[model samples]
Structure formats: C-alpha cells, structure tokens
Target: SSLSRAVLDGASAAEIEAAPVPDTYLALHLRAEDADMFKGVADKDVRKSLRLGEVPMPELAPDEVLVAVMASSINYNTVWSAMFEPIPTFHFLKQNARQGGWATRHDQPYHVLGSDCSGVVVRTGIGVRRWKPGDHVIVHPAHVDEQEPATHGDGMLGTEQRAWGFETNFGGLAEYGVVRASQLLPKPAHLTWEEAAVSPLCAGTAYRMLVSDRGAQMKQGDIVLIWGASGGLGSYAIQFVKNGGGIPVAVVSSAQKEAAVRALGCDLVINRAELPRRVVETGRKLAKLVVEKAGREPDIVFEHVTFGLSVIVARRGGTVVTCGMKLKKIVGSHGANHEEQQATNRLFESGAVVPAMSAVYPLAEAAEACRVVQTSRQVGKVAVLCMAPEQGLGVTDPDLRARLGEDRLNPLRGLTA
Candidate 1:
C-alpha cells in the first residue's frame, strides 16, 4: 500500500497526506456466519475461525483518523473473539450498529480484531486537530464518547466504554485501520513499531490494575503478589510495582517462566503448578510460602488468574484487585482511562518500562501468533507485522535504545511457557 510505503520512507507530511487511501485492505477478521461453527467441537481452534483477506474500507467519521498500521499485537481478547467464546464479537458490532449515525459502519459481516498497534496517521478526518498525517503513534484501545457525562470524569466509566478493536470495528490487525483521533498516543521513540504495538492494551491495563487510583493504589513498601508473572499483563504489573517502589512477588507455573520473571528484577519468585483439591489447605500453604519468602503477606493481590487463594494470601485489610473477573471481594478494574494510558506511555518513553514482546509474526501468520498467545506458549506479548515489511523497523531513537540495551529491552525474547 502507498500509505505504508510513505510511512516507511519517512515521507513529508504533505506527501503522506496526499497518499490515496485504498478502497480495500488486507485484514484478519472473523465472519459472523461462522460464529456457531464450533458449536460441538471438543477444543476450539482460533486458526479455523480467523480469516485473512481484503475487507472494504469504510468512510472515516469526523472525529476519526486512518492509520497505516506498522504492527499489531495479539491480546487475550483476540483469542476470545477468534474462538467465538463467551459470545461472538459480532454481537458487539451489531449493538454498536443499532446506535445509528456513524456507528452503523461497524455492522459488517466480517469483524476485524486487534486491541493494540503502532502506526502512522495517514489521514485525519475534518474534526481532528491534535494529530495529522505522518504522525507516529501507538493507539490506546479504550473507546468512549467524550460527549457522555460519565466519560468527562473517567473514560472507562462511561456506559458506552468499549474496547476499540474488540468491541468496535476496523481494528489494528490489518494493513490499515480506522481509529478515533482521541485514541492516539505519541509512539515511544526508542522502540520499534512491533515493540511499541505490544504495549498499549496490556501495559495500559496493568497500569490501571496497579498504579491507577481506581485500582490497587499501590504505595511504597507495598508487597504485590503477581500471578502469571511472565505473561503480558503480569510482566507489566511487575514493572509497575517495581517502578512504584513496591515489592513484587512473582508466581509462575514453570521453571522457565520463573526465570523470565526473575530477569525482570523480581527476586521473590515462586514456581507452582496447581493448588491441591482442598482449597483451605492450599490457600494456607501458599500464604505461608509467601510470608516465608517476602517476610509478610502481599499488600495487594493482583488477581487475574485466581480466586479463593488470593483472598487467603492477602494481608489483613489488603486490597485484591483484578482486571478480569477472577476474584473474591475484588475491586474490579477495567480498561485504562486516557490519563492512565498517557502515564503508561510516559513510562515507556523514559525507558522506565519496556515491551515484554517475546515473538513476532507477519500479518499473514496472525493465526499462528494468536495460537501462541491462546495456548500460553508465548512468554509475554506476541506481535504481528502489519504494514511493516519485517521486524526491527520504526525505531527513531538509536541513542535511547543503546542506553537501555537489548538485553534489558528483550529479557524474555525467545523464552516461552
């Protein structure tokens, strides 16, 4: 696509602005009609449902921008959409379409799926002012109408708050994507497109889960118990806990995963497979283990992958928070607000946090990339090159990258669970 070429070549803003938008572009999507195809299948396979093909480009709304996506990463929501589990994503498209006006564009038979991307703004709609053509950006996936009163305070609290690509359409897993101008965040200059692409969704979610006042509100000297410590969300949660002056106690399922987390500067690591059948006994044992290792129970139990054990392990009057529903007396944390996302971006910009991406695949091999994420074979985030021709492209700050060092930036590069 000319738009992608222009971005890669670092064309002038005017040249990029003049680049013609294609009428159709390649994208990975799920067909609404195939939503029930896995009805009685023993194990749902995402590879069978995800289709890569040309999808018609829709007209951009006044507040939207057309992005020439350089890279996108697979999130758990992509797996959920591809598997058609918990309810087909098409249902979300239908609901958005019923709202009328510009939203009707989302009601297509094929639903594009991806929640994170690093890209160039190739065209901006009439109402957009903060960004323009040729702007390098990483998209934050929280979608909300600024006109809503609830969104004025916190975008995530809006009744219409939706995970942009997951709940809406024309997402990032393609050659080009349409996003609200508001979703734009300046891409971290030191990172490659693939690296920056992997951060927004998972990184932002982790920021909200621990750093945000609405979530755990972690403080100095606080002890945080992080489950799945080497995975996407947990990787960022560990970094945030460390950056916030807290102690991170990482819990993993295997020795390789334990090694991966320990590399992230977490000294307190526990490798446990599964809890025993007796819930009470297992909880007591796990709590005792944490106390022995860290010298006290966790001040904040980061519970995305636990329930009773989390409540049992937390210190007295401690908070147990979750971004997902896995919980007990949990304070539910949803997607990050615009402020929280910006704070996360700043962390990346300062090199205080780096992407946890472990693998990279081209857009054509997106199903395989998603399979790695779905099956827990990926150590952290997995990226898919979209408009980018290959890996290692889009780093604008060589000095910063050198200062951070490759070993620190990619600690879990090839290691997987």
Candidate 2:
C-alpha cells in the first residue's frame, strides 16, 4: 500500500490523504495499542452458531507486511462462517490430511472473517524488498509456503497451505490486518480500491477455475449457465462466459433484476421463481434452446450449489463450477454430504469448473448482507470497505455526501477537479 511506501519516502499523513475519501488513501497507524477490536462468528449458519467476541489486531511478522484494509466484499463462505456453523468436515482436513498443517489450530473462531483484502501497506516487515509502502496491490487470499503442486495452480487440491480468511486470523474485516509479502499482486490501474477489494475471491477464484484449470472451451453461441447470475461471482461469470463467445443463460430468482441480468446480454434469462417441478420444466426448455437453436448442449453450467441444481443443469461429462449454495444451506444441504462434495468437486484435479464471487463484507455487516442475499432475491454478493488502504479513489454515490458530513468527508469541496 502507498502508506508503507510513503513512510519509506518520509511522507506525511496529510500528504497521502490529499487525494480523496473512499477513492484513494494511505493506510496509517491503526490502534495506538494492541488489543481486541472486533467480534466474529464461529459458524456459517446465521441463526445457529453466530458467536461474537473480541479478537486481536494482527501484528506484522519480520518477513510479513501489514495492511490497513481499505475495502473487501462479502462472500458466500464468509457469510456461512459468520452467521452459522461451518461444514464441520474441514476440522479433520488439517491434521488428518497430512499434506498440510495450516488449518484447525484451535476451536475458537473470532478472527476477522474476510477472505479477500484490498488495502495499502502501512508498515513493512523486516528485510522486505520487492514491496515498499504505498504500492497499490491485490493480496492473494490463499496463503501457502509450499514449493510445488499448490504454487503451480494446484493449491485448492494440494492440502499444503491455508485459506487466507478461513484458516488464518488476520483477514480484511478489521481496520488493519497482516499477511505475508509473497501473496501481493500488482494492482491493475483500471480498478478502484473498492472494486479491487471485491475482485480477489470471486474473480481470482473464477480465473483459477475457468481460465487456469478447467478445459472448458468457448466459442460463438456456446450456452453457459450463470446460476447465481446476478450475484458477485455470477457477475464475472456472465462477463467471462460472454467474452469467451458463449451464450450466458442467466438463472435468476428475481424478476426485478431481469433488466440488470439481461443487461449482460445473456442469450436468455431463466427465472428460478418457478422452482422444483416448474424450475426443472424451465430448465429443460432452456436446455433445449441451447441444444437446438444455439447449436450447443449447454456448453457449460455455472452451478454454485452442492446438490440439486448441479445435477439438473449439467449434461454427462459437461462442466459445473460454482462457489455458493443459498438454497442448500436453507434446506439442510439435502442431508447428503458425500453427494454434495462429490457433485461440487467432481472435477477435482481435472478442473472442469470454477467458483465466482460477488463481494466481501466486514464481519460487522456480513450477516446483514447475507440475510439480503439468502432471501433468494440478491443480484450479487455484498462487500465491505475498510478504507485507508489504497490510492486514486473516486467519489461513489454523491447522495451520501451530506450524510457522511459533506464538509469533512468531501474535504476538497469540489475544488481542483
């Protein structure tokens, strides 16, 4: 982050903040003292295991860099972990797997619950060189130190490292968090901090699934199912599938977002409002449209559930990559564990499909957003902005100017534009 760079350059806080609010910033001193600053959940089921308590503000390791997170988006996994109980199987994954010892150190769950982070470097770890303070970068969510397998795009399966927010404590929820230096990637000049913050989990995961691993091909008129079509991950899936020369058949739960969904120029939109028999009936019709008129048999189906719909949308040997399950979580995941995992991870090493993200949210509002998302009416994932991490931010929603204190929030007062 620019803050770390500025410290190295001997810059001042006022100098870094000279740009804009919520647009660009230099992460600064978080807390005067180290102490518990937040409360987090112990499970993914919102009403069940939502235990709240204080946790520590992360400290930077000698080789690690500290980030004052500017922003991160809400993700499905985060929502599950925040409001309710986790899948419980990952408990044995760390010790039993033998390949990795990254997760399940303690049973306590109060670490910041955000997998993706976008912020500026406020302080550098000892002996750090490639990154200085103030450098805009995207922090990779997966933290691993293994030599091979995981490093060469096999981390999801290679049980050597830890998932950033889930396994490790320091996540994007707090005002400040710490991470190793190797995970940072050069920030794209085209994105804002909020946009950058939201990109990593869904977007990066999608990249790993679709472009990196899955052998899914794209061409003119190929039909692709964007299951959570209006969501954080589905947004990218639609764009990715469309850009790949495929017809994005968006499966949505709301008619209000028909315009927003159709805005992506999907070949057609299927409303899941007609669920069960009606949903299957519509599914068959959509499948036929792709098979007959589009000259393809649903080239790909972007499924995010662990059961039910995954089986409905995919053809034999076809692809089903996903990252979420609003319906299953509500309905007990169909009391089928192996079947669900097998269905979602069917592509395992072969990498047939990938997960997409909608956004990241701070632990404070993760449940709130999840409630909205879980209502079967969300268009995308809801994210959170920690602020004080990056540079070159732009004003979002001028309507908020007066409420956040127009004079103070918008310090420049419409000058020097």
Candidate 3:
C-alpha cells in the first residue's frame, strides 16, 4: 500500500511480471495407476477416469513457481488427453520420466492436467527473482528452455518448448499447479477468476493464428474470414479481428453461435453448413459466397477447420492463418510467444477481450467437466472450480463488471444442464 498509484502506474511492466511463487495446493490428477483403465476407450467413456484428490506438492525447479489456482478451463487438448485417443498420454509421461530428477517426478503414476489458470502466487523457487508471493496472474501453457539459441528469436521455435499439460506435468485444473515464472502474466484486474482463466490457452493459439506477424499479420481495413467464429478459438479470433481494425466475416454452423458472433458486432455472420450449395460442392463455392459477403476477397483468411476454404477465399498473395493446422512454415505459432501475450492482458483489462465459459463445475466433478467439452455441446469454454467454492467468488471490480454486462461477459456461463 505504500507504493503510490502514480509510482505503480509509472512502474515498468517487467518488474511486476516478477510476481508470485506458491507452495502446495489441491489438484485434480490422472493416476498412472489407471493408465490402462481408460486407454482405447471412447472420449465420453474415458473421461470417467479423472479423479479430484490431494497431491503432495512437488519440488519446484530453479525457474519454477507454485500457483494457488482459482480456476481453469477445458480445451481440445485436455479432451484428447482424457480420451487417450490417437495414443495414450502415458506415452508422453514415460518420455518425460526418462529425463529423471524433478522431471522424473512428473512421470509419477499421477498426471495433473489442464493448461489454463487464474490465481495467486504462493512461492517461487531459488532462481525465480522476477516473481515473489501474493501477485495475481494467469499462466500460458507453453514451457520452453531458453538455454537454446534457437529460442532467442522465438520460444515456440525452440525444440525444447512443449505444451504444459500435454508434454509436461502439473497443469491448472487444481488448487495449485507448478509453472515456469516465464508463463505468468499479471491477471487483468477487471474480470472475475473464471473469466480470466479461460483465455490464455485458446486466446494465445488465436493470437499466433492471427495477431502474431508469424500468422496473418492482419492490418486495418483487412477483410478477415473466420471459421467457427462461435467456438473457443473462433470466439477469440472475432475479438482479435476487432482489435486489429479488420473486418470479420464470421462462419458458424449453429444458430446460437451465429447470434453470439453477430452480437459481438461482426457484420457478416453465416451459418456455413446451411448454405444452399450441396454437401458435395467444393470449398470454392463457399469461397465465392464469402467474397460476395465481403464485397471483395478476404485480405486474410483465418482457418481452424476450414483450410480448404481459407486457401480459396484468401486474396492472391494474401495471408491465410490456421489455428490448429499449418499450410505455411513459421507463420504459425513459433511455439511460445513470451511477448505476444503481454498485450492480451491489456485487452482483457480494457474489456476489449473476454472469456466465454459455457459452464463451471467444482474440481470434484472434473471428469464430468471434460465430458461436456468433449461432447462439443459447449458454445464456448467449460471451466472447473478449484479452492473457490462456487461461481462469483472473485469479482473484485464492480464498476467494470456493471458495464461489461453479464450476458455479454459470460454468454457461455451456466449453460450446461
């Protein structure tokens, strides 16, 4: 409290970024004991194995910190991990175990999963001078070893970078999770815990897909066509288009999503599946439709699921950005964007960006939570509660809350039956 608002406001962004480090906390984990219990099971059937229980705090590495997580949200990656689809997550676990030390601890029978978090710092490891205790923050999932020179330009490009929960251990769906200090960002002050928790994973993917120069490098007046505009990645993409001063032609498959995208002020919203063209038609047909809607070809085409349409609709020599796919080299996420995420904090603080949480459940119910996201019934994101007993536990700013509008802020909230 001694620091004046003037001094704090004028303080450098890098200093506060060196904030919290926490000790032990409760977390939801998948036991290596059950590694085969859900293997080869259907996604819905496999989700039954996730259990909410206490985990002893693991020792932090030189650069790591412990976070007391307030909330975390589901992503396709979690769903994939839970399902044991394609291959078992244990495969990745065993690989990490091969490294030994604290790394070997991650290979333990229990694997904590969930990539996003909104929480406070409890403790920092020996080498973590940047962050201390008590700072509020959100964590990005990419973990990169900066020792490699290849990472000097972009951490994502670094061969050592790996998704937090996917390739590594101790993810966010818990009371506490371990993360590298580099993953922490000052939590946007205006939003509630759940609101802040959903953005980092999905929003970061969207940023690298559209905002990063590696992606589309969108510009003012550019017509950007967004696929799945109402889904997780699409939701953020729509906001990014607005933030970048570009025009968004939103494509959705459901009426609910269309309504949601249009409410965000997107001028051209289309239910792509309901178009007049036969299912047999080529993507060019949809491209032409998008051209007609925009009155010109898209200067930048962003695709999560519509790579074919993106290639066709993009103007000659223009850019096409894909969230989960890659048609061009390096334009996609260079792995970890330690710098790109800095601005996302600003977007959330200003109400220019928000998370869409379809439903919230307690950590005890994490399995059911993953099932909901796995089912695709969600219009946006599904978040799990940790430590916090109920919804609405962390709303610190009333004036900003009143202006953001409950529905506009959380259209996806409490939607699950």
TM-score of each prediction: 0.97, 0.65, 0.87
Q: What are the lDDT figures for the candidates, one per model?
A: 0.89, 0.50, 0.74
Of 1 and 2, the candidate ahead on TM-score is 1
Ordered by TM-score, highest first, the candidates read 1, 3, 2
The weakest ten consecutive residues by lDDT in model 1 span 322-331
Candidate 3: stretches off by over 4 Å: 1-25, 38-44, 275-281, 325-331, 334-336, 403-408, 411-417
1-417 per-residue lDDT for model 1 (tens digits):
676677889999998877787889999999999999999897789999999999998999999999999999999999999999899999999999888999999999999988899999988899999897888999989888888999988889987889988899999999888998889999999899999999899898999889988788899899999988899999999999999999999999888899889878899988776456677788888898888888898889997837778887887788888767223347888679899999999999999998998889999999999888888887888999998987888888999899999788987788888
Q: Give the candidate number with the greatest lDDT.
A: 1
Tens digits of per-residue lDDT for model 3 on 31-67? 6666567544443464566777767778778889877
**Model 1 residue 404 CA deviation in Å:** 1.3
TM-score of model number 2: 0.65
- Backbone clashes (count) for model 1: 0
lDDT of 2 by residue, 1-417 (tens): 454344334455465444222222222111212212223632334433333334544444566776767666666655544432334323423333353332333222234556676666666777677776566666766665546565465444344456665555566665556676756665543344555566566655554444432424445566776676666666656766665566777777666555556554565776765444665765576667556645566656666632455545566656655544222111110011111222223331122332222344444554555555555445544556565333336233344333443233211111110
lDDT for predicted candidate 2 compared with the true structure: 0.50
Candidate 1 TM-score, true structure as reference: 0.97
